[PDB]
Write a structure and sequence with these properties.
Order of helices and strands of chain A: EHEHHHEEHHHEHEEH
Number of helices of chain A: 9
CATH topology of the largest domain in chain A: Recoverin, domain 1
Largest sheet of chain A: 5 strands, parallel
Radius of gyration of chain A: 19 Å
Shape of chain A: globular
CATH architecture of the largest domain in chain A: Orthogonal Bundle
Helix content of chain A: 40-55%
CATH class of the largest domain in chain A: Mainly Alpha
Oligomer: homodimer
Bound molecules: 2'-deoxyguanosine-5'-monophosphate, magnesium ion
Strand order of the largest sheet of chain A: 2-5-1-6-7
Strand content of chain A: 5-15%
């Protein structure tokens, strides 16, 4: 099995490459933001449970026929509540440093110190709450930035360890968005492929929308033409590995 | 940080190599069997409290002035309860596939099937219970063979990633005993270094480094310095 980490801003051709690889090769995929979306879909169902709030499922957090930039018109209190349920969920997958979950009859809550950092972080976010902003907030604003910078790489490692030994040719991580994820990837001997559209940018200022640095050893596919030109570049890049 | 997995049989000089590295470089060490001794020391403290059993601390589970071969005279029954408490401790570190821990008012226990597999497995162990047989039963008879072949390597992965930006030059795992664990180390980008003596062992695969301990300590030491040099 060959481990590949893909890197590319929105609409750079990176998502196209990911799909080209998944449909033309024996590949298994793992999304770093996978568990972010599972935790939010779970928290949401706990939050919108017996409310008149719309039912958002994993598919919607996946963006399947749902615009994740849609304003959900939520209050900072609602958002804090959701983040606390998302944390209780994640803590059952892998312990978040400094977080404890307590039960009061099917009512899960985090410890005060953790609940207090959630509150402070959320209270200072003035953006409107979309599925997209909730992903950015859970992933980065809270966890990476305040509890465990390597949590999402840790969950990828547990998955990889379950699968490195199977019959797939490739193991792809298509959504690398933080430099430290790239650092872990290079350390583990992953091939890092950047898909770049000559002089283009991310229309989101969140750190997870920023273009990742190209370091020595990284491969770069310049998407400066047609689609088959891209498909050819992909084929010849992989043929080499 | 360079990830190094050391391999070698008893008296090959593998242990001397881990020591020299730890003593001469910015290095941090992780034992795959660490959590095994921690869980047993935990499960032990909890069960020998109720009884008139010897008090074994994490210090004797480490074999620190204790013979881990020492028979403890346990009922397959107590061994089974010790084992379930240890699963409870480990499950809080990283979930063991197919195990759920529940609180019974000042008493967590594992779901029934996990409980049932534990009993079945501990019931065919016809041996005598030393601390050392307990480590094996927990580590291999149970977890690796019946729950998750990769569980000890998953716990190393959590710790390695945790130390990822810590400033150490090397991360050394010295006690790998299974080949599947060495496969996982290679899959995670480790350099495998075998310490062998001229005339059981894990296989030496293509890419692994081999240090032949055929001379003196200072010669062993010199071979280690030059091997670390080209990593
Ligand atoms: N890769 C990654 N994504 C993160 C992190 N924290 C938050 N996210 C966000 C970035 C994306 O907006 C999102 C997943 O969205 P998408 O890949 O489009 O389903 O999760 C992090 O640490 N790593
Ligand atoms: N590395 C490793 N050690 C294991 C595993 N299962 C059980 N062990 C235990 C059995 C040995 O007696 C013990 C070594 O403990 P020590 O003497 O403190 O280094 O490791 C396993 O899967 N991997
Ligand atoms: Mg909950
Ligand atoms: Mg316990």
């Amino acid at each position: 099995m060959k481990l590949i980490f893909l890197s590319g801003v929105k609409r750079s051709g990176k998502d196209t490459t990911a799909d080209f690889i998944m449909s033309n090769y024996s590949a298994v995929k793992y999304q770093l933001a996978g568990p972010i979306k599972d935790a939010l879909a779970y928290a949401w169902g706990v939050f919108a449970a017996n409310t008149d709030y719309p039912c958002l499922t994993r598919k919607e957090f996946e963006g399947i026929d749902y615009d994740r930039e849609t304003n959900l018109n939520l209050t900072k209190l609602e958002v804090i509540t959701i983040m606390e349920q998302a944390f209780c969920y994640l803590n059952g997958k892998s312990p978040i440093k400094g977080v404890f979950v307590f039960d009061d009859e099917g009512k899960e809550s985090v410890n005060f110190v953790a609940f207090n950092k959630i509150t402070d972080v959320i209270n200072n976010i003035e953006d409107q709450w979309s599925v997209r902003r909730l992903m950015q907030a859970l992933g980065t604003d809270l966890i990476v930035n305040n509890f465990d910078r390597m949590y999402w790489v840790k969950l990828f490692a547990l998955d990889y360890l379950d699968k490195f030994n199977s019959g797939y040719d490739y193991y792809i991580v298509p959504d690398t968005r933080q430099d430290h994820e790239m650092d872990a990837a290079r350390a583990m001997g992953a091939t890092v492929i950047h898909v770049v559209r000559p002089g283009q940018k991310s229309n989101d200022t969140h750190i997870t929308e920023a273009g990742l640095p190209i370091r020595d050893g990284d491969l770069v596919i310049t998407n400066d033409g047609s689609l088959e030109e891209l498909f050819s570049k992909i084929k010849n890049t992989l043929k080499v590995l």
